[PDB]
Write a protein that binds this ligand. Structure first.
Ligand SMILES: CN(O)C(=O)CC[C@H](C[C@H](N)C(=O)O)C(=O)O
Ligand SMILES: CN(O)C(=O)CC[C@H](C[C@H](N)C(=O)O)C(=O)O
Ligand SMILES: [Cl-]
Ligand SMILES: [Cl-]
Ligand SMILES: [K+]
Ligand SMILES: [K+]
Ligand SMILES: [K+]
Ligand SMILES: [K+]
Lengths: 253, 253
């Protein structure tokens, strides 16, 4: 009955440093939608945890030798018991680690500065002018690296080519959409949040696919099922919809 | 340490009635790639099983009230412990049941009678003449019912419309490709097998996506993990590639 190791990274509004005048330490340093989720699971399931930020600051992708990085690596290597973060359940990652049932559903879409009236990814694929891209070693990059659709094959061709098109993280990518003629391939529910705070930014097109965020565990983890079940209970009483509204509630445009 | 209930259905060359002069009963009635897989898992993991054919003869899809049928229903309702069959791991079904790690990877493609030189699904979507379709209440139908791609949205529009375009099973669909101007949306590894036996049939286009076949269990099943691990062991020694060659080895064209 020890404290579980939780791996995570910084992403508004899922995991953040809470603001204080004193210097925070431990779990107390963190807040956000996933912190509220983790707290709720800990309570329902009766466990405690120590939260640790993944050292490379990545979600996780396979390299060209088949090696993982990011939080995925952390679970593979059993350095963490859970990955609590906006981690995308992909069948590609399901060969290295396990997921709980999804706690949020989102799609890939396009974040872009209002102005040039593009309306779809076809518009981007067919031109070099507006540069686009994704977060390096994330699920949105991999989705493009793996796709058989000739549009997304065409788009990945472009990100593959350009050195500056694959950004280190979400924050840096949002910055590029604000300071360059640049379109960031991003996840839907984050686009929602971003475009509520940043009124010169908008979503382009609708969803480019459908997927879910899950809690990551090593393969054959004994908490996988307990967590899945609690997440489903929370979901059926629409608590997760309420938790989402709490952290997405913002100004307006 | 009781015998597990296995749910299954008839599909060449995964599950079949073996040929005998006497009347078979029990597990002895069955043979095929999945039978060989089930046998191997039983041996590695030390369990026994009673195989039962799902009464409605379906893999499983949600109706318009959210209700499941087929083998998916069988696991939900705990009538079976495992689904051993060419069952497609879809995130849609992962809300009702669990999957093991995949034992085979396949994509959707098009099975069609050689003649009219179509080369892609775009060709089908854009015309009414050659009728196409899929197996009713299967993963390939659902994939079309759920898709956001305007081509597959267009194709699903057509299957949705036509009463005869959604076939009862694989067998009946293959029959329609042979006796009508008709293209069956099917899974890759089955197309391989079919087109080796039936030389007026061919595959049109490449893969339309990527996915896997897994062993289905109810949610939070205690064999899910044991089975996943054994399947991975089998896979790393490339036994599953050998098992596949055993059942796909056929004449030629
Ligand atoms: C919310 N969030 O996480 C972001 O927008 C950051 C980048 C995401 C990460 C993704 N969820 C993964 O699991 O790789 C992306 O690759 O699009
Ligand atoms: C091998 N096989 O099973 C077939 O071709 C028959 C129909 C498949 C079933 C699919 N694997 C499912 O899990 O729904 C399809 O929906 O395309
Ligand atoms: Cl830390
Ligand atoms: Cl039976
Ligand atoms: K501080
Ligand atoms: K504890
Ligand atoms: K017989
Ligand atoms: K037994």
């Amino acid at each position: 009955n020890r404290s579980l190791i939780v791996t995570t990274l910084l992403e508004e509004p899922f995991v953040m440093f809470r603001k204080s005048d004193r210097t925070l330490y431990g779990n107390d340093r963190f807040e956000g939608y996933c912190i509220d989720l983790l707290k709720e699971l800990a309570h329902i399931l009766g466990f405690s945890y120590e939260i640790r930020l993944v050292e490379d600051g990545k979600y996780g992708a396979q390299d060209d030798k088949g090696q993982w990085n990011g939080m995925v690596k952390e679970l593979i290597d059993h350095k963490a018991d859970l990955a609590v973060a906006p981690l995308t359940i992909t069948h590609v990652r399901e060969k290295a680690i396990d997921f709980s049932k999804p706690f949020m559903t989102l799609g890939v879409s396009i974040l872009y500065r209002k102005g040039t009236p593009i309306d779809s990814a076809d518009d981007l694929a067919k031109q070099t002018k507006i540069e686009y891209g994704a977060v390096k070693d994330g699920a949105t990059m991999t989705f493009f690296k793996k796709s058989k659709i000739s549009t997304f094959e065409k788009m990945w061709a472009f990100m593959s080519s350009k050195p500056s098109a694959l950004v280190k993280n979400n924050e840096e990518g949002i910055q590029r959409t604000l300071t360059a003629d640049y379109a960031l391939l991003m996840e839907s529910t984050t686009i929602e949040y971003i475009t509520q705070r940043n009124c010169n930014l908008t979503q382009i097109g609708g969803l480019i696919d459908s997927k879910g965020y899950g809690i990551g565990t090593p393969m054959g983890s004994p908490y996988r099922d307990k967590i899945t079940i609690a997440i489903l209970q929370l979901q059926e009483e629409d608590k997760l919809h309420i938790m989402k509204e709490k952290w997405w509630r913002g100004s307006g445009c």
